[PDB]
Structure 1
Amino acid sequence: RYKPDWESLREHTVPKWFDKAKFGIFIHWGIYSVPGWATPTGELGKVPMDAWFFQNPYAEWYENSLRIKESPTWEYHVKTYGENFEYEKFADLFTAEKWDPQEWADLFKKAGAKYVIPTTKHHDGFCLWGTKYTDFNSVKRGPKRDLVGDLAKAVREAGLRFGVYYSGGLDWRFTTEPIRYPEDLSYIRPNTYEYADYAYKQVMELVDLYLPDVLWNDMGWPEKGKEDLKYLFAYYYNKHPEGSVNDRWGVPHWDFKTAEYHVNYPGDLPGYKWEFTRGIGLSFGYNRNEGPEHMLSVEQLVYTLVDVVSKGGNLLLNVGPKGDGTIPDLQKERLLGLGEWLRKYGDAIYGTSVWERCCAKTEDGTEIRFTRKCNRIFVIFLGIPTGEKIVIEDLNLSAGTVRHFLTGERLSFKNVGKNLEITVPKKLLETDSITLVLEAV
C-alpha cells in the first residue's frame, strides 16, 4: 500500500500508459462558454503581464475580466447582456442542448488522442457534476445533467483514458476582487479553512465517483490544505495505482510536470516526464473572436506534437466547446487533420522513448526530431525536403540500415564528416504527408 507521506508516495511514478499515450485532449467547458468571448491578444509568455489581465485572451477568465470595469470584456458584456446581468446567470443559459458525449469521444478517438480531461471546476467555481458540496453545478442549473459523469462513460466506451481537471488554487465564488496583476495572485485567493476542506472534499468526491486516470490540478493547492494531499494522493493511488497527478499542487509529489504555451517549455530533453498544454487558438474556453489567424494549422499541430514527443512529453491539446455542447468546425477540422497524420505515422509517436538527442536540422534548415522504439530510430523531418539529396548536420549513424518509414524502402546513406547524407527518391518524398519520416535500425 502507499502510505500518507511524501517518502512513500515517491514510490509512485508516472504510469506506463501515460508515458506511452503521447497525446491527450483538454476540454475547457463551462458557463463561460456561453458568452464565449475574449480579446485574442497573444500567447501566454509573449503578452506583457502588466496588460494580460486587462486584455485577457483566455475566454474562460471572462468573470475575472468582467470584474475589471472598463476592460474590453466589461464593455462587451454591458452592450450584449446588460449591466444587470450577473456572471452567475450564465449558468441558466448553459444548456448543452446539442451535446452528444459519444460524438465527442469518437471525434477525440478519431483525432488520435488516448486520454481526455475535462474541466470539472474551473476558476469561476461552477462544477460540471452533481457535487454535493455546492448547488452551483450543472445538475442543479443549466444542463440539469452530470457532464463529467456522462462524458467519463463516453470516453471510456471509446476506449480512451479519462482524467479530471480541478481548479484547486482559484475559486471566484470565494473572492470578490479581480486579479489585475500577477502579484494579486499572492493574496486574492479563498484563503479559508473552509475552502481547503471544500477543495479536498470535492477532489475526494471526483475520485470516489469517477476514479480518474489523471488528477490535473491548477493554480496550486490552498496552503492550509497542502498536508491533506499526502492523504488524498495515497487514497487515490491505493484505489487506482495506475492513476497519475500533475505538478501544480505546490507539494513534494507529482508524476509529471506541465508547460503552458511558452511557459516552462523545455528546449531540450528535461529528464522527467512532462506535458505541454495549449488551446488550438489562444484561449482554452471557446472564443467566438478567434478565426483561423489565431489558430495552429494542422501542419503546426503535427510539428508541435512531434517536438513535444521527441523531448519526452505528451501534448495535452485543448478543445473549447460552445455553450450548446458543440465543437466549433475550426477546431474539429484541425483535430481530424492531426488524427489523419497520426493514423499514418502513429508508429513513430505512440509508445516511443526519447533518443540520445531530440533534435537536428538539414543543411538548409529543415528541423528534425527523433523518437525511439528499442533499436528502431525514427527520423522525423518537420516538413518534406524538395530535393532527393539530404544532408543532416551534426549527425552520424552506426545503423548500417536506414529505411523510408511509410514504404519500408531501404535507402542509400553514408556518414560524411560530422554530417549524415541520404538520398530519398522523389517518388517516396511524394508519398509522405506533412513530414518525411525515416526509420534507422
Structure 2
Amino acid sequence: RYKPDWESLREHTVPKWFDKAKFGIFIHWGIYSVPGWATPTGELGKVPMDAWFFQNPYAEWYENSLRIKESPTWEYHVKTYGENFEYEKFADLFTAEKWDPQEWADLFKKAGAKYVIPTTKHHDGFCLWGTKYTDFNSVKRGPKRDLVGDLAKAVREAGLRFGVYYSGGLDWRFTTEPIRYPEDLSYIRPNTYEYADYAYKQVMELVDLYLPDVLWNDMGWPEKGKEDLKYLFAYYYNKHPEGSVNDRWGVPHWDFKTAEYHVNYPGDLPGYKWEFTRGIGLSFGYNRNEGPEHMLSVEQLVYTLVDVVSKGGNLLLNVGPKGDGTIPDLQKERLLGLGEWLRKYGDAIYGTSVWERCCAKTEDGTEIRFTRKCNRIFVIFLGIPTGEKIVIEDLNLSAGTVRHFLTGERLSFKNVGKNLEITVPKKLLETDSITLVLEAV
C-alpha cells in the first residue's frame, strides 16, 4: 500500500515491463487531425523560438496558430474554411468514419511496439472518451464513440500495454489569447482552482475507467493542483502497482524521464529509466503537407531506436492519423519497416540492459551501440560495413567468443592494442539488414 506522500511514493519504481518494453507507439489524434495542416518549418531546437509559434510545424497546434491572425494557419484557414468557421466546428467533422481499432492494434503489434499511448485530451481540450466533466468529447460530438476505451480494448486484446496522454498543463478552452512566444507559457494557462479540479477529476476518471499502464501528462501540472498528485499517484498505484507515471508533472515523483532532441537527450548512460519521443515526421498530429522528405526513413528509425536503447531508454514513436481514422501510408510503411527489422533483431533489443558503455565507432567512422542480456553482449552497427576487416576503436574484449548474431556463426577477432579487430565474412555481412549485429559472450 502506497501512502499519499512523496517519500512513500518513492517506493514505487519503474515497473519491469516498461523497462523491458523498449518501444511504444504515441498517437496524437483529435479534431485538429481534420484540417491536418501545418507549415513543415523544421525540428524543435533548430527553428528560432521568436518565430516558432508563428510558423508552427505541429499540426496539433492548429487552434493556437489560428488564434494568431495572419499566421500561415490563419490564411490557410480563412481561404479553406472561411472566417465564419470556428475551430470547435471541427469536432463535428471528426467522424473517424474509417476507424477500426483492431486494425490499429494489429499494425502497432506488427511494428514491434509493446505499449500504445493515445492523446486522451490535447491542448485544445477536446476529450476522446465519454467524460462526464465536459460535453466537448468524442461520445457527444463527431465520432459518437468512446475512442480511448475502444482502442484500449483492442490494444489489450493484441497483448500490448495501454497508457494515456493527458494535457494537464494546457487547455485552450480555458484561455483566449494564443501563445506567441515561449515566455507566454509562464502566464497564459487556465490558472483557476476550477481548472485544477477538472484536471484532477479527469485523470482520476481515466484511472477508474481504463486503469492505464502509463499516465503520460504534458506541459506540467496546474500549480494549484500539484498537491493533489500525492493522492492521485497513491490511488493509482494502489489499484495498479504495475502502472507508471512520466516526469511532466512538476512534482517530486516520476517513474521515468522523458526527452526530445532539444531536451534531456543523453550522450552516455544515465542512472534512471527514461523514454525518447519524437514523431515519424516534424508534427505530432497529422500534417497533409509533409512528404517523405520531412520524415525519418526506416533506417534512421532503427538507428534512433538502437541509440536510445543502448542508453537505457525506450522509444515512444508518434503516429499522426487522419480525421477519418486511417493511418497515412508514409507512416504505416515506416512502421512496418521498423517492425521487420525488430522481428529479426528483437532479441538484441527487448529485455536488454545497458552495458558498461553505450557507444563506439569503427576506424572508418561507423557508429556502434551496445546492449546486454546477462553474459551476452550485443554489438549493433548503425550501418553495415563493406569490407570484411573491421577495426573498432578503443575497445578490447575479455570474452572468449564473438558470433555473428543472425547466423550464430563464431567469428575470429583479436584485441590489437587499444582496438578490436573482427573478420566478418562478406556472406554474413550480406545477410544483415540495416545493421550488422554481433554477439559476444
Please, which moves more after superposition, 180-189 or 258-267?
258-267
SS of the residue corresponding to residue 49 of structure 2 reads: coil
Deviations 1:207-254 (A, max 9, x none): 000000000000000000000000000000000000000000000000
Deviations 1:402-440 (A, max 9, x none): 000000000000000110000000000000000000000
Question: In the aligned structure 2, how far is the partner of 1:267 from the partner of 1:61?
Answer: 30
Does the 8 Å CA contact 1:43/1:262 hold for their aligned counterparts?
no
Question: In the aligned structure 2, how far is the partner of 1:260 from the partner of 1:215?
Answer: 18
The residue number in structure 2 matching 1:52 is 52
SS of the residue corresponding to residue 173 of structure 1 reads: helix
| 2:286 corresponds to 1:302 | no
Structure 1 runs not aligned, ≥5 long: none
- 1:314 deviates by 0.3
- 1:267 deviates by 1.1
- 1:48 deviates by 1.1
Does the 8 Å CA contact 1:377/1:439 hold for their aligned counterparts?
yes
Question: In the aligned structure 2, how far is the partner of 1:415 from the partner of 1:141?
Answer: 66
Question: In the aligned structure 2, how far is the partner of 1:366 from the partner of 1:262?
Answer: 24
Question: In the aligned structure 2, how far is the partner of 1:411 from the partner of 1:437?
Answer: 12
Deviations 1:156-201 (A, max 9, x none): 0000000000000000000000000000000000000000000000
Question: In the aligned structure 1, how far is the partner of 2:295 from the partner of 2:261?
Answer: 13
- 1:389 deviates by 0.2
Deviations 1:251-291 (A, max 9, x none): 00000000123322111111111000010000000000000
Q: How many residues align?
A: 441
Q: Which of structure 1's runs of 4+ aligned residues deviate more than 6 A?
A: none
Deviations 1:44-72 (A, max 9, x none): 11111111100100000000000000100
Question: In the aligned structure 1, how far is the partner of 2:390 from the partner of 2:203?
Answer: 53
SS of the residue corresponding to residue 430 of structure 1 reads: helix
Does the 8 Å CA contact 1:44/1:263 hold for their aligned counterparts?
no
Deviations 1:332-386 (A, max 9, x none): 0000000000000000000000000000000000000000000100000000000
Please, which moves more after superposition, 256-265 or 427-436?
256-265
Does the 8 Å CA contact 1:26/1:319 hold for their aligned counterparts?
yes
Question: In the aligned structure 2, how far is the partner of 1:398 from the partner of 1:266?
Answer: 27
Question: In the aligned structure 1, how far is the partner of 2:332 from the partner of 2:264?
Answer: 27
- 1:319 deviates by 0.3
The residue number in structure 2 matching 1:228 is 228
Question: In the aligned structure 2, how far is the partner of 1:271 from the partner of 1:190?
Answer: 35
Question: In the aligned structure 1, how far is the partner of 2:5 from the partner of 2:338?
Answer: 41
Question: In the aligned structure 1, how far is the partner of 2:45 from the partner of 2:359?
Answer: 23
Please, which moves more after superposition, 249-258 or 42-51?
42-51
The residue number in structure 2 matching 1:184 is 184
Does the 8 Å CA contact 1:44/1:261 hold for their aligned counterparts?
yes
Using the size of structure 1 for normalisation, the TM-score is 1.00
| 2:285 corresponds to 1:285 | yes
SS of the residue corresponding to residue 380 of structure 1 reads: strand
The residue number in structure 1 matching 2:125 is 125
SS of the residue corresponding to residue 120 of structure 1 reads: strand
Question: In the aligned structure 2, how far is the partner of 1:43 from the partner of 1:298?
Answer: 18
Question: In the aligned structure 2, how far is the partner of 1:277 from the partner of 1:203?
Answer: 22
SS of the residue corresponding to residue 53 of structure 2 reads: helix
Structure 2 runs not aligned, ≥5 long: none
SS of the residue corresponding to residue 318 of structure 2 reads: strand
Question: In the aligned structure 1, how far is the partner of 2:178 from the partner of 2:240?
Answer: 38
Question: In the aligned structure 2, how far is the partner of 1:438 from the partner of 1:288?
Answer: 40
Question: In the aligned structure 2, how far is the partner of 1:260 from the partner of 1:178?
Answer: 24
Deviations 1:300-356 (A, max 9, x none): 000000000000000000000000000000000000000000000000000000000
Question: In the aligned structure 2, how far is the partner of 1:127 from the partner of 1:64?
Answer: 17
SS of the residue corresponding to residue 51 of structure 1 reads: helix
SS of the residue corresponding to residue 345 of structure 2 reads: helix
Question: In the aligned structure 2, how far is the partner of 1:84 from the partner of 1:395?
Answer: 66
Aligned CA RMSD, in angstroms, stands at 0.4
SS of the residue corresponding to residue 12 of structure 2 reads: coil
- 1:295 deviates by 0.2
SS of the residue corresponding to residue 54 of structure 1 reads: coil
Question: In the aligned structure 1, how far is the partner of 2:139 from the partner of 2:179?
Answer: 29
The residue number in structure 1 matching 2:429 is 429
Does the 8 Å CA contact 1:413/1:421 hold for their aligned counterparts?
yes
Question: In the aligned structure 1, how far is the partner of 2:45 from the partner of 2:409?
Answer: 43
Question: In the aligned structure 2, how far is the partner of 1:203 from the partner of 1:175?
Answer: 20
Question: In the aligned structure 2, how far is the partner of 1:394 from the partner of 1:38?
Answer: 45
